[PDB]
Amino acid sequence: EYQDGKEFGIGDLVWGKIKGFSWWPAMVVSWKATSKRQAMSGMRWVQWFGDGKFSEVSADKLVALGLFSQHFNLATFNKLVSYRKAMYHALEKARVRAGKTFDQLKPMLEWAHGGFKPTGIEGLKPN
């Protein structure tokens, strides 16, 4: 699945961009998780943190969640509790995976905005 030469694989934490919304954190999933259909070549199914819904998104409309400060939207974060909830669940997941200990958002956000230290982006990988 997803053998199209384009970026991203199953389990990858990503920012995803669909019409009408800020960049939003998501996880790349298999089409079978979606009970929908196979993604068009060049595209990935993602499941969004916060609301748990699925979108089929172009691999060119996805970036690694690791590039955090570059896509974090501070205005959206201040404006929307749904975005703040989305950030928590996505960063929680980021934490567990990498090795990171530490309104409980604060040091998660700082750690994220700071570049996911000590581990770096490398510790965001799925397995």
């Binding site: 019409k19 919304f21 929908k36 819904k53 699925f54 979108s55």
Partner: peptide, 7 residues
């Protein structure tokens, strides 16, 4: 409240 996200 489930399924596919609507833009």
């Amino acid at each position: 409240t489930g399924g596919v996200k609507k833009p």
